[PDB]
Amino acid sequence: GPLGSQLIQEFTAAQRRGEIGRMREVAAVLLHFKGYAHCVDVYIKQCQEGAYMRNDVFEDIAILCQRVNKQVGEVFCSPETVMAKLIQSIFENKIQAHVKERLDETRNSDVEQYLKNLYDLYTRTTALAAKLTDYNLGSDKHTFLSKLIKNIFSCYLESYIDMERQYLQNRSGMILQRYYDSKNHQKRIDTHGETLLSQEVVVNLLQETRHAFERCNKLSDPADLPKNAFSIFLILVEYLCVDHIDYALEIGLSAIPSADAKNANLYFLDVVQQANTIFHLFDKQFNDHLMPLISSSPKLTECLHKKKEVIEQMEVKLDTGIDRTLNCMIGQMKYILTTEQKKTDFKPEDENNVMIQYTTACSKVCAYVGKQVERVRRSMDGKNVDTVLTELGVRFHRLIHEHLQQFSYSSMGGMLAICDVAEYRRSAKDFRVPLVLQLFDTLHALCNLLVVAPDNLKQVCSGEQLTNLDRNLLHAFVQLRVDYRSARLGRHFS
Ligand SMILES: [Br-]
Ligand SMILES: [Br-]
Ligand SMILES: [Br-]
Ligand SMILES: [Br-]
Ligand SMILES: [Br-]
Ligand SMILES: [Br-]
Ligand SMILES: [Br-]
Ligand SMILES: [Br-]
Ligand SMILES: [Br-]
Ligand SMILES: [Br-]
């Protein structure tokens, strides 16, 4: 019939000014007809008009819902259905308008600020939805809020991961270019030991990626959180690893003079030092930040495999470079020995007038060794420096060991050999590595063989420093004696 439902305008008047049960009476009448849905509707519009006048909209709607809750119980019979209508109106209108307002402007002017706003707006909305769930709305309310948040973020959170990666690729690219421009280095003799490894570029790349993970944690669907957080990681290993540090490792690998003369190749040891600190900053953000997001991954086993693979590819290159730098040093110590150690040193031309000291070949080497050891300590941190010295010291002991075996020794030449080793031992003591010192300790005892009289030869072999050594090793040194044939020293087949 002629619905004079425009007594709904009588309800509007009652709400305008004055607190009354007149709102209740008109509402109680209106539930008898279709139009009770419209009455509560205009009630929501009116109480919202004077509300939004604050800098913070999420506090404004929090105060709005509390004052409406105490009033709605006075006016309507089923406050729970009215209340759900309220917050739905707040979300579908006010919240969605405030989100579209913040994002449209910054979307085509500041992509990073867009991501930081989308993250902030989504966080405050969820925190707000947790405040609204405290009210006695119709249970299953949790699903109700979830649909409201989804209906105003579904398309923002859909194209999220693509904008996040497009941003990170571009921002990382700009950081790398800005660094290679400040060094006047176009991609693909340099006297400077330029490592091309910035501890600023890496820490700024990690700064950027860390923040991307945090946004990824809350803005990515939990079912796709692992695959999304790993997509971001692959961007890091493409710019930080492949493009920055792996590039500087190959560039630094070509500045090695290849075991020749005149080598100012302190360069690569500086590269090893920086790369190690970079690695410590790398896996630190990996364990603390990326791992909590990837822990629940279907194929986490393949995620850890690529992380390991990447960090081993460059681990090997560092091991190739430390090896090439070491035999460059061994190459020079060998050069000193061949050109400055003659036969007449251990096989003196005239037995009569010989002053026994360590050879000039010995001092030239020890002086060189010490000059390089110093450069190693000054170019590396305490942890990885002892592993390098150990290798150098082992190779150092190896060189002298085989060097001593290509000479014949007279009675007089014997002492000169010990004097050499004794000085070599002091040079090795400067390594501060027990292994190197102990290796020359056995070589020192070994030289004792080509000095003692033939009758006390098998006696000395029974000594504490020699007994626990292989008989073949004792034999190799006895053969170096000039009177190995002149005496019955062939009794070393036992
Ligand atoms: Br009115
Ligand atoms: Br209703
Ligand atoms: Br952020
Ligand atoms: Br959240
Ligand atoms: Br409930
Ligand atoms: Br930078
Ligand atoms: Br990439
Ligand atoms: Br280091
Ligand atoms: Br980090
Ligand atoms: Br001496």
Residue numbers in the entry: -4 to 0, 195 to 377, 403 to 708
Wording from the paper:
The exocyst complex consists of Sec3, Sec5, Sec6, Sec8, Sec10, Sec15, Exo70 and Exo84. In this study, we report the near-full-length structure of zebrafish Sec10 (zSec10).
Among the expression constructs tested in this study, we obtained clusters of daggerlike small crystals from zSec10195–708 (Δ385–394). Bromide soaking improved the diffraction from ~4 Å to 3 Å or higher. The final refined model includes 10 bromide atoms and 2 water molecules. zSec10 folds into an elongated rod with dimensions of 150 Å × 40 Å × 25 Å. The corresponding region of zSec10 forms a cave with negative charges, which are derived primarily from acidic residues on the loop connecting domains C and D. This cave could electrostatically interact with the conserved lysine residues (i.e., Lys3, Lys7 and Lys12) of Arf6 in the N-terminal region, which is required for the interaction with Sec1027.
